[PDB]
C-alpha cells in the first residue's frame, strides 16, 4: 500500500486523432498539439501503420531552453538533450523509396538547429514497427512518464489486440523502460509523426502525404494511494483505486483484495488537497541588511550592541554577490523554511571576533568568548552568520580597534552584556586599582593586519534572534500570498503556520492581538486572516464514521455505505461531494436515502417487512442481500434494510379458572460448544 | 543497517529497531494473557457443566440444556468438549377447567402433587407435567381449616 | 477509532511517515470491532431468551396482585414501565448516548464541544444495535410470560396458570403447604403491593442505581477524553502541534520530531485498546451471571441461596436499564421466632 | 506508585521535563487505586455476609 | 547523564529513561489488572460457596 502519482481508475482520457487523408473521402486535418505534462502523463496508441514515432519534452520548445527528444527510426532509439529551435509543426522525414537509391534517408524535420547538448542515449527499438494494414490495430503501446529529482523515467507495456476505436478496458502493469539523468524542468509536450509520401510534405506547401489515420490516448497522473499485488516475479498483477469508490476504499483499510459479508468502517481514502493558500501580512519593505551587515565599523564583541527588526521583509537573496557566508547555522529552524515564515520579534547581535573563535559563538560552547563575551543560551532558536572581513577591518599598520575581555571572575549569563573595566586582582593581594603584579587591566585589543593567517583575521558575526508567538508578525519571508479558497479543503499557511482544513467563515471573537486559537486537543481551529483581519475557523478535511456493507466480493459488487450521525441532506456537504470521484457522488445523493436513527444510509432500498437480522446496522436496522424475482420481473438481487423483529407476537389466554397440563412429551437431544483450552506458544 | 553503518551510528538504528520488537512481543504477550483468562472462565464453566450435567441431575434452568433436564453425555472435540443434554418439554398443552381447595364436609381439600382438574361436571386431580386423572380420595389430598379459600369450589372426596 | 486521523490528521507527510512505520492500525481496530460485537451478544443472551413476545394480558389483577408499575405504560411514546420510566432518570448519561449530529460541530459560535473533540481526532460512538425500546419489549414478554404461565414458558410453550393457584406452588417449594397461602392470600398480596411501592418511592430520592451503571458510563467517557488530552503531550518531541514540526524544520529533521510523536500517540492509541479489553472483560462477566440470573430467577424459582435475593426465593422480575438490567427479588422471610420445646 | 519518584527520583531537571513529555502517571494511578478498592470489596462480599 | 552532559544533550539521553520507565511502570499496570481481575472471579467464587 503506497502513495505516490498515479493514474486514477476510470480517469478521463482525452482522444486525439489524424488526418487519415486516404480514408477520410479526399480530406486531411493535421493536429498533434503541444499539451500540458502535469506531473506525469500516461500515454497509450493502438496503431497498424508505425505512424507514432516519439515526443518532444520542454517548457518553451525553443532555443533559449533544453529540451528533450526521443524519435524511434527503425533499428536503434535515439534520445537527446540538446537545444532545439523545434518547429511549429514537427513530424519526421522520409517514409519509404522502391528502388530510387533513396530507400530510408530519414532527415528531420524537427528542428531547424541543435546546439549545447548534454546528453545522448541510444538503444534498441521500442516494443514493434514498420507493420502496414488495415482495419486492425494488433498492437497497443502504453507509456508514462515521470519527472522526479533530475531523472527522466519512462515505464511501457506492449500488447497485441484487434480493435477499431476503442481503448480496450482491462488491467495494465507497465515495467521501466529507462531512468535517464537529463536534469531539466519539463512543462508541456508533444509528439512525433511520421507523415511522409515519397517526400515529407506537398509539393509547396501542403500535407498531401500518407496519413494513416494517427490516434492516441493521453491521461494525467494525481497524488493516490494504491494497494498493489505482487506475484511471485515480482509482477504487478492487481490494484486497487483507494480513492475511487466505497469498495475501494473498504479493500484498502483491510489490505486484502476479497471482501466477506459484513459491515466494515474505514479509512478516509476519499478527498486530497488540489490546491494551497498563502496569507501573508502587506509588508512590501526589504530589511536593512544593507546597513545592518554593510556598515563601517562593527561593535567589539565584549560591547555587542543588540538592535531589533521591525516591520520589513527577509530576503537574504540580496547579500548573494554582495557577501559571502563562511557560516550560517540556524536553531530551531531549517534554512529552507526561512523563506515560510513570519517571526513577531527579531534582535542582530553584531560584532567582530577572530576567524578561530567563530566557532565559539554556538549554544553549549566554551572559550574566551563563550566565557567572558558573548554566551549564546541553550534554546536559542535564531540563526548565526558569520563572514571573514579582513577587507574593511585589516589595515596595512594594524587595526586595534575591537577590543576583547581576558579576565572575568565568573562567566557570563547567555545575552549578558559587561563593559565593567575594572583592575582583576588575580592572586589575593589587594589591587587598589593598579596594574601590578597580579592585576592585569581586562580588556585587550585585536591586532588586524592584512598579513595575518586565515585564523587571526576578523571576521562579522551576526546572531539572529527572533520568536514565533500569537502575536502579530513583523518580520515576514519573501512568500507572495495567494487568493482566499474559503470552501473547499485546502493547504493554507497564513503567518508561517501551516495547515489542511476547510477554510470557513467563523463567528468566534479574538483579542485585538490574538492570530489563532487552539482546542482541548493542541490543534489550531481558527486562524485570522492578516490581510482582511477577519476570523475564520479550520475544520478537519477528513469526515469519520463512515461504514461500507457489502454481502462479499465473491457474491456481488453493489454496497451501501453509512453516514453515522448525518443528516441526509448534509452528507454532499459533510464528505465534500464535489471534490469526489464521480463514483463517490452515487453515494452521497441517491434515489434510495434512508435515515436511520444512527445516520444517512444510502445504496439501500427500505422496505417495511422485518425479518431476522443478517446484517446489523444499528439502532434496530439491518440490512441484507436479497433477490428480487418474485418482487419483480427479470429482477436482479439488491440490498435492503429493515428494521428487525423480535421474534413472533404471541398472547397467552390467561384467566381464574383455566389451566393448560401436557397430555404427550418429546424428548430432545441439543448440544452445546466450549472452549476448553487455546495454543500454548513460547 | 550493519552493512551501511559504523557501529556508533548503527546502534541508533538498532535501538529502533529493538525498541519496536520488544513492543511487538509485549504486545503479543498482553493479548494472549486477555485471552487465556477468557478462556478460563469457559474452561470453568465446562468444568461446572460436566459435574452438574453428567454427574448428576440439575435444577438449574437452561444449565443443562432447555427443558427439563434428563441427563446429559460429554464429547471430546478440538480443544473443547461438547455436551449432548437430554431434555424433557412437555408438548400437547390442552386446556382445562381447575380450581384449588374444593370444599367437601364443611372442610377444605388441598391436593399433594396435584392441580384438580374438571372434567366436564366431573373433578380429578393431575400431576402438573402430565395428563393422568385420579379420583379425588383421602390420600391424593389433604385438609386443612374451613371453606375461606377464594374459589373453593363444592365436591365430593371419596 | 480511525488511526490516522487521530494521529496524523490531515497530513500526507505525516500519513506517509506512518505507512512506513508499521501496521498496527489494523491491529488495534481488530480489537475493538470484537469488543463491540460482543457488546450486542451480551444484550441478546441476557433479553433475548425467549422468542415469543407475549402480549400483556389485558386483566390487570391476578387474585391481588397489582403489577401496574412494572407492566408497559401504552400512554407514552416509550412503551416502557413506570419504573424502567424511573430507572432512565438516575443515570445522567451526559455522553455521545444523547446524540450529536456533525451539522452540530460545523456550526459553531463560542468553543468546539469535547464530544467533537473526539469526532474531528477519529473517535467515534457506535450505536447499540437493539434500540432501548426493543429492550423494553423483551422485558415486558417476560413479564407477561412470567405472570401467566410460571415455570412453564422457560422450559417449553406457555402454559396458562392462575396467578394466586401459581403462587401456591412458589409457596410449595420452599418448604411451606399450600393452604398458607390462601389463607392469607390478601395479607400476602397486600404485603407485595406494599414492597413495590417503596421501592418506587425509593426509586426517586437518593440515586442509589446510579451505583454500577453510571460508573461504567464515567469510566468510558473519561478514557475518551483521556485519549484525546493526550494529544498534547510532547513525547520528547519539540511541540505536541504537527503543523509546528512540519512549519519550521525540514522532511530530514522534521520526521525525527514527528516519530516522537508516531510513538508516542501509538502508545497511547494501544493502552486505550487494552484497558478497554480488560473492561470489556469484566462486563462480559457481569452480563453471563445477569443471563445466569435470568433464566434461573425469572424462569424458574432457585433452590441456591442468596442468588435470587435474601429470603427464600418466590418470583423475580426484570426491568430494563441503561447498559444494564434490575431484578425485583420477591423472597419470604419468616418473621416471628417464637420459642417451643422439641 | 508515586510516578516522580520512580522515574526522576529527586531530579528537578527530570522532574521538568517528565512534565511536559505527558501526564500518563495520573491514568497509571487511577488504575492502581481501582485494583486496591477492589481488594476490600473481595474481603467484604466473602466475608461480611 | 546530569553530570557529564549539557542540558541540551542530557535531555536527549534522559527522554530514553523516562521512556523506558513509563513503558516498565505500564508493564507493571497492566499486568496487575490482569491478576486482578483473575482475583475478583475466584473472590466472587468464594462469596458464592
Ligand atoms: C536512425 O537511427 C540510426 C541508429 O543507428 C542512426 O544511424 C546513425 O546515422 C548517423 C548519421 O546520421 C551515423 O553517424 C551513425 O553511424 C549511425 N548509427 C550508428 C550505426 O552508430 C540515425 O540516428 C538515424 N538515421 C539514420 C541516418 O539512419
Ligand atoms: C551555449 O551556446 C552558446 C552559443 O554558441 C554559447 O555562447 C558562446 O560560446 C562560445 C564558445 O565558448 C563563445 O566563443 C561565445 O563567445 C559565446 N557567445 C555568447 C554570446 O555567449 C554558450 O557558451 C553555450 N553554453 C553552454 C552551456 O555550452
Ligand atoms: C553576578 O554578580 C554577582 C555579584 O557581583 C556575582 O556574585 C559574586 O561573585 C564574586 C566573585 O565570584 C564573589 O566574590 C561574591 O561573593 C559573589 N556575590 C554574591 C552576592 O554571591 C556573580 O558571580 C555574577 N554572576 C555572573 C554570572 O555574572
Ligand atoms: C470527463 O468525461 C465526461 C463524460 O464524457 C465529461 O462529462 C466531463 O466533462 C469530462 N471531464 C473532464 C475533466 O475532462
Ligand atoms: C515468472 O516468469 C517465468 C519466466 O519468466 C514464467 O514462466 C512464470 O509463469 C512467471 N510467473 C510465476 C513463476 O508465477
Ligand atoms: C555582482 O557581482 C559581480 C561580480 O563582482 C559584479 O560584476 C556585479 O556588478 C555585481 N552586481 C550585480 C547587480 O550583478
Ligand atoms: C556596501 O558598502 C560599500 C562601501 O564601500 C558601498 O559602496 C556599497 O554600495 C554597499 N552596498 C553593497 C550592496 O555593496
Ligand atoms: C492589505 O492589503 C489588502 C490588499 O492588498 C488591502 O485590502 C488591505 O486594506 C491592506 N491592509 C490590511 C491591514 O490588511
Ligand atoms: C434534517 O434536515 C431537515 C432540513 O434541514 C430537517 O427538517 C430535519 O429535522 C433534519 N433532521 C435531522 C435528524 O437533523
Ligand atoms: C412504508 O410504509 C410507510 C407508512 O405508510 C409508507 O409511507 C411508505 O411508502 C412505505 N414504503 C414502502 C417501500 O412500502
Ligand atoms: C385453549 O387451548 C388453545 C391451545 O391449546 C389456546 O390457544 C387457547 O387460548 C386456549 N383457550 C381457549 C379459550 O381457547
Ligand atoms: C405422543 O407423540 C408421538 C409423536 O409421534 C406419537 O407417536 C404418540 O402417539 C403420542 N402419544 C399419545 C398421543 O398418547
Ligand atoms: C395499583 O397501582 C395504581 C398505580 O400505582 C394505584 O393507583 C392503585 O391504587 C393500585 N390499585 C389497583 C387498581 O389495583
Ligand atoms: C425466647 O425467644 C426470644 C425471642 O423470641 C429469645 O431472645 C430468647 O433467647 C428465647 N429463649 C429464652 C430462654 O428466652
Same mark, same amino acid.
Given at each position: 500500500?503506497?502513495?505516490?502519482?498515479?493514474?486514477?481508475?476510470?480517469?478521463?482520457?482525452?482522444?486525439?486523432?489524424?488526418?487519415?487523408?486516404?480514408?477520410?473521402?479526399?480530406?486531411?486535418?493535421?493536429?498533434?498539439?503541444?499539451?500540458?505534462?502535469?506531473?506525469?502523463?500516461?500515454?497509450?496508441?493502438?496503431?497498424?501503420?508505425?505512424?507514432?514515432?516519439?515526443?518532444?519534452?520542454?517548457?518553451?520548445?525553443?532555443?533559449?531552453?533544453?529540451?528533450?527528444?526521443?524519435?524511434?527510426?527503425?533499428?536503434?532509439?535515439?534520445?537527446?538533450?540538446?537545444?532545439?529551435?523545434?518547429?511549429?509543426?514537427?513530424?519526421?522525414?522520409?517514409?519509404?523509396?522502391?528502388?530510387?537509391?533513396?530507400?530510408?534517408?530519414?532527415?528531420?524535420?524537427?528542428?531547424?538547429?541543435?546546439?549545447?547538448?548534454?546528453?545522448?542515449?541510444?538503444?534498441?527499438?521500442?516494443?514493434?514497427?514498420?507493420?502496414?494494414?488495415?482495419?486492425?490495430?494488433?498492437?497497443?503501446?502504453?507509456?508514462?512518464?515521470?519527472?522526479?529529482?533530475?531523472?527522466?523515467?519512462?515505464?511501457?507495456?506492449?500488447?497485441?489486440?484487434?480493435?477499431?476505436?476503442?481503448?480496450?478496458?482491462?488491467?495494465? /502493469?507497465?515495467?521501466?523502460?529507462?531512468?535517464?539523468?537529463?536534469?531539466?524542468?519539463?512543462?508541456?509536450?508533444?509528439?512525433?509523426?511520421?507523415?511522409?509520401?515519397?517526400?515529407?510534405?506537398?509539393? *509547396?506547401?501542403?500535407?498531401?502525404?500518407?496519413?494513416?489515420?494517427?490516434?492516441?490516448?493521453?491521461?494525467?497522473?494525481?497524488?493516490?494511494?494504491?494497494?498493489?499485488?505482487?506475484?511471485?516475479?515480482?509482477?504487478?498483477?492487481?490494484?486497487?483505486?483507494?480513492?475511487?469508490?466505497?469498495?475501494?476504499?473498504?479493500?484498502?483499510?483491510?489490505?486484502?483484495?476479497?471482501?466477506?459479508?459484513?459491515?466494515?468502517?474505514?479509512?478516509?481514502?476519499?478527498?486530497?488537497?488540489?490546491?494551497?493558500?498563502?496569507?501573508?501580512?502587506?509588508?512590501?519593505?526589504?530589511?536593512?541588511?544593507?546597513?545592518?551587515?554593510?556598515?563601517?565599523?562593527?561593535?567589539?564583541?565584549?560591547?555587542?550592541?543588540?538592535?531589533?527588526?521591525?516591520?520589513?521583509?527577509?530576503?537574504?537573496?540580496?547579500?548573494?554577490?554582495?557577501?559571502?557566508?563562511?557560516?550560517?547555522?540556524?536553531?530551531?529552524?531549517?534554512?529552507?523554511?526561512?523563506?515560510?515564515?513570519?517571526?513577531?520579534?527579531?534582535?542582530?547581535?553584531?560584532?567582530?571576533?577572530?576567524?578561530?573563535?567563530?566557532?565559539?559563538?554556538?549554544?553549549? @560552547?566554551?572559550?574566551?568568548?563563550?566565557?567572558?563575551?558573548?554566551?549564546?543560551?541553550? *534554546?536559542?532558536?535564531?540563526?548565526?552568520?558569520?563572514?571573514?572581513?579582513?577587507?574593511? *577591518? /585589516?589595515?596595512?599598520?594594524?587595526?586595534?580597534?575591537?577590543?576583547?575581555?581576558?579576565?572575568?571572575?565568573?562567566?557570563?549569563?547567555?545575552?549578558?552584556?559587561?563593559?565593567?573595566?575594572?583592575?582583576?586582582?588575580?592572586?589575593?593581594?589587594?589591587?587598589?586599582?593598579?596594574?601590578?603584579?597580579?592585576?592585569?587591566?581586562?580588556?585587550?585589543?585585536?591586532?588586524?593586519?592584512?598579513?595575518?593567517?586565515?585564523?587571526?583575521?576578523?571576521?562579522?558575526?551576526?546572531?539572529?534572534?527572533?520568536?514565533?508567538?500569537?502575536?502579530?508578525?513583523?518580520?515576514?519571508?519573501?512568500?507572495?500570498?495567494?487568493?482566499?479558497?474559503?470552501?473547499?479543503?485546502?493547504?493554507?499557511?497564513?503567518?508561517?503556520?501551516?495547515?489542511?482544513?476547510?477554510?470557513?467563515?467563523?463567528?468566534?471573537?479574538?483579542?485585538?492581538?490574538?492570530?489563532?486559537?487552539?482546542?482541548?486537543?493542541?490543534?489550531?481551529?481558527?486562524?485570522?486572516?492578516?490581510?482582511?483581519?477577519?476570523?475564520?475557523?479550520?475544520?478537519?478535511?477528513?469526515?469519520?464514521?463512515?461504514?461500507?456493507?457489502?454481502?462479499?466480493?465473491?457474491?456481488?459488487?453493489?454496497?451501501?455505505?453509512?453516514?453515522?450521525?448525518?443528516?441526509?441532506?448534509?452528507?454532499?456537504?459533510?464528505?465534500? /461531494?464535489?471534490?469526489?470521484?464521480?463514483?463517490?457522488?452515487?453515494?452521497?445523493?441517491?434515489?434510495?436515502?434512508?435515515?436511520?436513527? /444512527?445516520?444517512?444510509?444510502?445504496?439501500?432500498?427500505?422496505?417495511?417487512?422485518?425479518?431476522?437480522?443478517?446484517?446489523?446496522?444499528?439502532?434496530?436496522?439491518?440490512?441484507?442481500?436479497?433477490? @428480487?424475482?418474485?418482487?419483480?420481473?427479470?429482477?436482479?438481487?439488491?440490498?435492503?434494510?429493515?428494521?428487525?423483529?423480535?421474534?413472533?407476537?404471541?398472547?397467552?389466554?390467561?384467566?381464574?379458572?383455566?389451566?393448560?397440563?401436557?397430555?404427550?412429551?418429546?424428548?430432545?437431544?441439543?448440544?452445546?460448544?466450549?472452549?476448553?483450552?487455546?495454543?500454548?506458544?513460547? | 543497517?550493519?552493512?551501511?553503518?559504523?557501529?556508533?551510528?548503527?546502534?541508533?538504528?538498532?535501538?529502533?529497531?529493538?525498541?519496536?520488537?520488544?513492543?511487538?512481543?509485549?504486545? $503479543?504477550?498482553?493479548?494472549?494473557?486477555?485471552?487465556?483468562?477468557?478462556?478460563?472462565?469457559?474452561?470453568?464453566?465446562?468444568?461446572?457443566?460436566?459435574?452438574?450435567? #453428567?454427574?448428576?441431575?440439575?435444577?438449574?434452568?437452561?444449565?443443562?440444556?432447555?427443558? $427439563?433436564?434428563?441427563?446429559?453425555?460429554?464429547?471430546?472435540?478440538?480443544?473443547?468438549?461438547?455436551?449432548?443434554?437430554?431434555?424433557?418439554?412437555?408438548?400437547?398443552?390442552?386446556?382445562?377447567?381447575?380450581?384449588?381447595?374444593?370444599?367437601?364436609?364443611?372442610?377444605?381439600?388441598?391436593?399433594?402433587?396435584?392441580?384438580?382438574?374438571?372434567?366436564?361436571?366431573?373433578?380429578?386431580?393431575?400431576?402438573?407435567?402430565? $395428563?393422568?386423572?385420579?379420583?379425588?380420595?383421602?390420600?391424593?389430598?389433604?385438609?386443612?381449616?374451613?371453606?375461606? #379459600?377464594?374459589?373453593?369450589?363444592?365436591?365430593?372426596?371419596? | 477509532?480511525?488511526?490516522?486521523?487521530?494521529?496524523?490528521?490531515?497530513? !500526507?507527510?505525516?500519513?506517509?511517515?506512518?505507512?512506513?512505520?508499521?501496521?498496527?492500525?489494523?491491529?488495534?481496530?481488530?480489537?475493538?470491532?470484537?469488543?463491540?460485537?460482543?457488546?450486542?451478544?451480551?444484550?441478546?443472551?441476557?433479553?433475548?431468551?425467549?422468542?415469543?413476545?407475549?402480549?400483556?394480558?389485558?386483566?390487570?389483577?391476578?387474585?391481588?396482585?397489582?403489577?401496574?408499575?412494572?407492566?408497559?405504560?401504552?400512554?407514552?411514546?416509550?412503551?416502557?414501565?413506570?419504573?424502567?420510566?424511573?430507572?432512565?432518570?438516575?443515570?445522567?448519561?451526559?455522553?455521545?448516548?444523547?446524540?450529536?449530529?456533525?451539522?452540530?460541530?460545523?456550526?459553531?459560535?463560542?468553543?468546539?464541544?469535547?464530544?467533537?473533540?473526539?469526532?474531528?481526532?477519529?473517535?467515534?460512538?457506535?450505536?447499540?444495535?437493539?434500540?432501548?425500546?426493543?429492550?423494553?419489549?423483551?422485558?415486558?414478554?417476560?413479564?407477561?410470560?412470567?405472570?401467566?404461565?410460571?415455570? !412453564?414458558?422457560?422450559?417449553?410453550?406457555?402454559?396458562?396458570?392462575?396467578?394466586?393457584?401459581?403462587?401456591?406452588?412458589?409457596?410449595?417449594?420452599?418448604?411451606?403447604?399450600?393452604?398458607?397461602?390462601?389463607?392469607?392470600?390478601?395479607?400476602?398480596?397486600?404485603?407485595?403491593?406494599?414492597?413495590?411501592?417503596?421501592?418506587?418511592?425509593?426509586?426517586?430520592?437518593?440515586?442509589?442505581?446510579?451505583?454500577?451503571?453510571?460508573?461504567?458510563?464515567?469510566?468510558?467517557?473519561?478514557?475518551?477524553?483521556?485519549?484525546?488530552?493526550?494529544?498534547?503531550?510532547?513525547?520528547?518531541?519539540?511541540?505536541?502541534?504537527?503543523?509546528?514540526?512540519?512549519?519550521?524544520?525540514?522532511?530530514?529533521?522534521?520526521?525525527?520530531?514527528?516519530?516522537?510523536?508516531?510513538?508516542?500517540?501509538?502508545?497511547?492509541?494501544?493502552?486505550?485498546? !487494552?484497558?478497554?479489553?480488560?473492561?470489556?472483560?469484566?462486563?462480559?462477566?457481569?452480563?453471563?451471571?445477569?443471563?445466569?440470573?435470568?433464566?434461573?430467577?425469572?424462569?424458574?424459582?432457585?433452590?441456591?441461596?442468596?442468588?435470587?435475593?435474601?429470603?427464600?426465593?418466590?418470583?423475580?422480575?426484570?426491568?430494563?436499564?441503561?447498559?444494564?438490567?434490575?431484578?425485583?427479588?420477591?423472597?419470604?422471610?419468616?418473621?416471628?421466632?417464637?420459642?417451643?420445646?422439641?
Amino acid at each position: 500500500l503506497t502513495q505516490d502519482l498515479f493514474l486514477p481508475f476510470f480517469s478521463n482520457v482525452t482522444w486525439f486523432h489524424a488526418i487519415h487523408v486516404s480514408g477520410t473521402n479526399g480530406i486531411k486535418r493535421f493536429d498533434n498539439p503541444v499539451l500540458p505534462f502535469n506531473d506525469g502523463v500516461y500515454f497509450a496508441s493502438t496503431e497498424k501503420s508505425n505512424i507514432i514515432r516519439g515526443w518532444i519534452f520542454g517548457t518553451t520548445l525553443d532555443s533559449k531552453t533544453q529540451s528533450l527528444l526521443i524519435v524511434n527510426n527503425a533499428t536503434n532509439v535515439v534520445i537527446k538533450v540538446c537545444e532545439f529551435q523545434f518547429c511549429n509543426d514537427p513530424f519526421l522525414g522520409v517514409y519509404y523509396h522502391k528502388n530510387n537509391k533513396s530507400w530510408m534517408e530519414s532527415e528531420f524535420r524537427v528542428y531547424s538547429s541543435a546546439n549545447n547538448c548534454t546528453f545522448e542515449y541510444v538503444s534498441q527499438p521500442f516494443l514493434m514497427d514498420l507493420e502496414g494494414k488495415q482495419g486492425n490495430f494488433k498492437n497497443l503501446r502504453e507509456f508514462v512518464f515521470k519527472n522526479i529529482d533530475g531523472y527522466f523515467k519512462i515505464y511501457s507495456k506492449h500488447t497485441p489486440i484487434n480493435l477499431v476505436r476503442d481503448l480496450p478496458p482491462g488491467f495494465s /502493469a507497465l515495467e521501466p523502460l529507462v531512468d535517464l539523468p537529463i536534469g531539466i524542468n519539463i512543462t508541456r509536450f508533444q509528439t512525433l509523426l511520421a507523415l511522409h509520401r515519397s517526400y515529407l510534405t506537398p509539393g *509547396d506547401s501542403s500535407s498531401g502525404w500518407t496519413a494513416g489515420a494517427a490516434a492516441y490516448y493521453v491521461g494525467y497522473l494525481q497524488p493516490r494511494t494504491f494497494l498493489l499485488k505482487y506475484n511471485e516475479n515480482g509482477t504487478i498483477t492487481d490494484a486497487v483505486d483507494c480513492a475511487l469508490d466505497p469498495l475501494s476504499e473498504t479493500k484498502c483499510t483491510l489490505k486484502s483484495f476479497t471482501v466477506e459479508k459484513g459491515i466494515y468502517q474505514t479509512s478516509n481514502f476519499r478527498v486530497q488537497p488540489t490546491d494551497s493558500i498563502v496569507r501573508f501580512p502587506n509588508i512590501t519593505n526589504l530589511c536593512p541588511f544593507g546597513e545592518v551587515f554593510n556598515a563601517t565599523t562593527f561593535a567589539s564583541v565584549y560591547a555587542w550592541n543588540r538592535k531589533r527588526i521591525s516591520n520589513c521583509v527577509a530576503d537574504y537573496s540580496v547579500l548573494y554577490n554582495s557577501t559571502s557566508f563562511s557560516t550560517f547555522k540556524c536553531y530551531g529552524v531549517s534554512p529552507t523554511k526561512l523563506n515560510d515564515l513570519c517571526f513577531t520579534n527579531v534582535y542582530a547581535d553584531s560584532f567582530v571576533i577572530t576567524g578561530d573563535e567563530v566557532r565559539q559563538i554556538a549554544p553549549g @560552547q566554551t572559550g574566551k568568548i563563550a566565557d567572558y563575551n558573548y554566551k549564546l543560551p541553550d *534554546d536559542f532558536t535564531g540563526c548565526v552568520i558569520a563572514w571573514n572581513s579582513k577587507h574593511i *577591518d /585589516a589595515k596595512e599598520g594594524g587595526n586595534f580597534n575591537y577590543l576583547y575581555r581576558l579576565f572575568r571572575k565568573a562567566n557570563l549569563k547567555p545575552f549578558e552584556r559587561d563593559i565593567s573595566t575594572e583592575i582583576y586582582q588575580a592572586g589575593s593581594k589587594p589591587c587598589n586599582g593598579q596594574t601590578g603584579l597580579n592585576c592585569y587591566y581586562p580588556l585587550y585589543r585585536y591586532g588586524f593586519y592584512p598579513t595575518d593567517g586565515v585564523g587571526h583575521q576578523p571576521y562579522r558575526v551576526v546572531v539572529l534572534s527572533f520568536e514565533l508567538l500569537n502575536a502579530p508578525a513583523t518580520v515576514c519571508g519573501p512568500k507572495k500570498s495567494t487568493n482566499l479558497v474559503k470552501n473547499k479543503c485546502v493547504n493554507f499557511n497564513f503567518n508561517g503556520l501551516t495547515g489542511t482544513g476547510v477554510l470557513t467563515e467563523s463567528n468566534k471573537k479574538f483579542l485585538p492581538f490574538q492570530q489563532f486559537g487552539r482546542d482541548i486537543a493542541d490543534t489550531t481551529d481558527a486562524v485570522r486572516d492578516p490581510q482582511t483581519l477577519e476570523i475564520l475557523d479550520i475544520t478537519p478535511c477528513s469526515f469519520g464514521g463512515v461504514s461500507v456493507i457489502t454481502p462479499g466480493t465473491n457474491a456481488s459488487n453493489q454496497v451501501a455505505v453509512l453516514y453515522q450521525d448525518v443528516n441526509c441532506t448534509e452528507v454532499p456537504v459533510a464528505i465534500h /461531494a464535489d471534490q469526489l470521484t464521480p463514483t463517490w457522488r452515487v453515494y452521497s445523493t441517491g434515489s434510495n436515502v434512508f435515515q436511520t436513527r /444512527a445516520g444517512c444510509l444510502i445504496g439501500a432500498e427500505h422496505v417495511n417487512n422485518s425479518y431476522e437480522c443478517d446484517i446489523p446496522i444499528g439502532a434496530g436496522i439491518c440490512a441484507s442481500y436479497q433477490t @428480487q424475482t418474485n418482487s419483480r420481473s427479470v429482477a436482479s438481487q439488491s440490498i435492503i434494510a429493515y428494521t428487525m423483529s423480535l421474534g413472533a407476537e404471541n398472547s397467552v389466554a390467561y384467566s381464574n379458572n383455566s389451566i393448560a397440563i401436557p397430555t404427550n412429551f418429546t424428548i430432545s437431544v441439543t448440544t452445546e460448544i466450549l472452549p476448553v483450552s487455546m495454543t500454548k506458544t513460547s | 543497517i550493519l552493512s551501511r553503518l559504523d557501529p556508533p551510528e548503527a546502534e541508533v538504528q538498532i535501538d529502533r529497531l529493538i525498541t519496536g520488537r520488544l513492543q511487538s512481543l509485549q504486545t $503479543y504477550v498482553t493479548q494472549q494473557l486477555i485471552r487465556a483468562a477468557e478462556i478460563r472462565a469457559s474452561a470453568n464453566l465446562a468444568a461446572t457443566k460436566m459435574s452438574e450435567c #453428567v454427574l448428576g441431575q440439575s435444577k438449574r434452568v437452561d444449565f443443562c440444556g432447555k427443558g $427439563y433436564h434428563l441427563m446429559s453425555f460429554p464429547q471430546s472435540a478440538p480443544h473443547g468438549v461438547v455436551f449432548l443434554h437430554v431434555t424433557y418439554v412437555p408438548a400437547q398443552e390442552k386446556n382445562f377447567t381447575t380450581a384449588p381447595a374444593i370444599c367437601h364436609d364443611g372442610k377444605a381439600h388441598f391436593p399433594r402433587e396435584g392441580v384438580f382438574v374438571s372434567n366436564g361436571t366431573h373433578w380429578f386431580v393431575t400431576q402438573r407435567n402430565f $395428563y393422568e386423572p385420579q379420583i379425588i380420595t383421602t390420600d391424593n389430598t389433604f385438609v386443612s381449616g374451613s371453606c375461606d #379459600v377464594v374459589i373453593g369450589i363444592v365436591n365430593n372426596t371419596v | 477509532v480511525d488511526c490516522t486521523m487521530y494521529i496524523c490528521g490531515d497530513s !500526507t507527510e505525516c500519513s506517509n511517515l506512518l505507512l512506513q512505520y508499521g501496521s498496527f492500525c489494523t491491529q488495534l481496530n481488530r480489537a475493538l470491532t470484537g469488543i463491540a460485537v460482543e457488546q450486542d451478544k451480551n444484550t441478546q443472551e441476557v433479553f433475548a431468551q425467549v422468542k415469543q413476545i407475549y402480549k400483556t394480558p389485558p386483566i390487570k389483577d391476578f387474585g391481588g396482585f397489582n403489577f401496574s408499575q412494572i407492566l408497559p405504560d401504552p400512554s407514552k411514546p416509550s412503551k416502557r414501565s413506570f419504573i424502567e420510566d424511573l430507572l432512565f432518570n438516575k443515570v445522567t448519561l451526559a455522553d455521545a448516548g444523547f446524540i450529536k449530529q456533525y451539522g452540530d460541530c460545523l456550526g459553531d459560535i463560542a468553543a468546539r464541544d469535547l464530544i467533537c473533540a473526539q469526532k474531528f481526532n477519529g473517535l467515534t460512538v457506535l450505536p447499540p444495535l437493539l434500540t432501548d425500546e426493543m429492550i423494553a419489549q423483551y422485558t415486558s414478554a417476560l413479564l407477561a410470560g412470567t405472570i401467566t404461565s410460571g415455570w !412453564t414458558f422457560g422450559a417449553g410453550a406457555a402454559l396458562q396458570i392462575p396467578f394466586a393457584m401459581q403462587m401456591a406452588y412458589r409457596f410449595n417449594g420452599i418448604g411451606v403447604t399450600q393452604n398458607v397461602l390462601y389463607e392469607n392470600q390478601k395479607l400476602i398480596a397486600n404485603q407485595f403491593n406494599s414492597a413495590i411501592g417503596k421501592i418506587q418511592d425509593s426509586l426517586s430520592s437518593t440515586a442509589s442505581a446510579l451505583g454500577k451503571l453510571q460508573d461504567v458510563v464515567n469510566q468510558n467517557a473519561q478514557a475518551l477524553n483521556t485519549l484525546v488530552k493526550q494529544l498534547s503531550s510532547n513525547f520528547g518531541a519539540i511541540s505536541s502541534v504537527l503543523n509546528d514540526i512540519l512549519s519550521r524544520l525540514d522532511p530530514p529533521e522534521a520526521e525525527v520530531q514527528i516519530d516522537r510523536l508516531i510513538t508516542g500517540r501509538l502508545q497511547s492509541l494501544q493502552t486505550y485498546v !487494552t484497558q478497554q479489553l480488560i473492561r470489556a472483560a469484566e462486563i462480559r462477566a457481569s452480563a453471563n451471571l445477569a443471563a445466569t440470573k435470568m433464566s434461573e430467577c425469572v424462569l424458574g424459582q432457585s433452590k441456591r441461596v442468596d442468588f435470587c435475593g435474601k429470603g427464600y426465593h418466590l418470583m423475580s422480575f426484570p426491568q430494563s436499564a441503561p447498559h444494564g438490567v434490575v431484578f425485583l427479588h420477591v423472597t419470604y422471610v419468616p418473621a416471628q421466632e417464637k420459642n417451643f420445646t422439641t
